[model samples]
Target: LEVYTPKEIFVANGTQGKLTCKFKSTTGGLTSVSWSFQPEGADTTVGFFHYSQGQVYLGNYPPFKDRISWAGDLDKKDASINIENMQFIHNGTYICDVKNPPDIVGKTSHIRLYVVEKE
Candidate 1:
């Protein structure tokens, strides 16, 4: 499986930035793919505060509630994220966890997000 992300940049205020994560498979394309956020300085044990399969998992992050949506397909083994109302707190490392039975058990792709404003 694989993942993709932006080249990192300082986005302007009151604008939109697209952050995407993707997972792929050869035979089993209908794997359970997911995207999550782990705050800087935190461990993976904390799990995902935001999860998406078909429904959404909005944890303690109220800012991400309703503003987050999926950009990929579950049947095709792709998982992506689109976060609106770009903010500073959205800055963090996003992880993509994918599971395709039989051959590939499970793995993850890590993408570091860098968000900033022009001085």
Candidate 2:
């Protein structure tokens, strides 16, 4: 199993931002997809989204709730999202963790997001 993501993504401030992630499973079917965020120069990260058991679980953290929505489908092997009103704090690295059964698991993909201020 493997996960894939773009090297970098740029989003204009105050505009919607999109982050795409996909995975390939050679064993069993995909079990879940988890989304995490790592700010620049930050060691700690937080998980904000999870898709499993045919449902979507969103974190309660402020600014992310209602501001982010799932843009991909598990059946299609896509685990992407759209962020509304991109802000400076949104600029960072996103990690997509994917899980599959039968020994294929914990495939992670990373994407760097840059929020550009409007001139």
Candidate 3:
């Protein structure tokens, strides 16, 4: 199979928007799935959730606290993330990464967010 995601996003300036990133394993077995957000001017080092382990990683931004959620069903092989209180800072390229040891390496699905001011 192949990774999949929505092509566009529509949201208001003060509202919130969620981006879905789907990861597929062509090796016929599920390994691990992860989600991440890369801001415009910073490095991508934030971890959202780990499948093998039940832990959520929060980065430098605390404003997003208690405003994010994971909606991925491993049985279907996709990771969907929800972000609340949309703002200009959330506008950036989001990446969904999957890894399966020696069998498969870095596989990613990218989603672009478009935040528009509500007139």
Best by lDDT: 2
Clashing pairs counted in every model: 0, 0, 0
Q: Compared with the true structure, what per-residue lDDT tens digits does model 1 show for residues 10-115?
A: 4454456455655555633335655677666777523343443456565556656656666666665456666766677766677667676533567776777666
Sorted on lDDT, highest at the top, how do the candidates line up? 2, 3, 1
Order of quality (TM-score): 2, 3, 1
lDDT of 2 by residue, 8-105 (tens): 99999999988898878652244788899988889988899987767789987685767878888777888888899989988789998888775444
Local accuracy by lDDT, each model: 0.59, 0.83, 0.66
lDDT of 3 at 13: 72
RMSD of 1: 3.5
Listed in order, each prediction's TM-score against the native is 0.68, 0.89, 0.73
Clashing pairs in 1: none
TM-score for predicted model 2 compared with the true structure: 0.89
Better of 1 and 3 by TM-score: 3
Model 2 C-alpha RMSD to native? 1.9
Q: Please report how far candidate 3 places residue 52 from its true position, in Å.
A: 3.1
TM-score of candidate 3 against the unseen true structure: 0.73
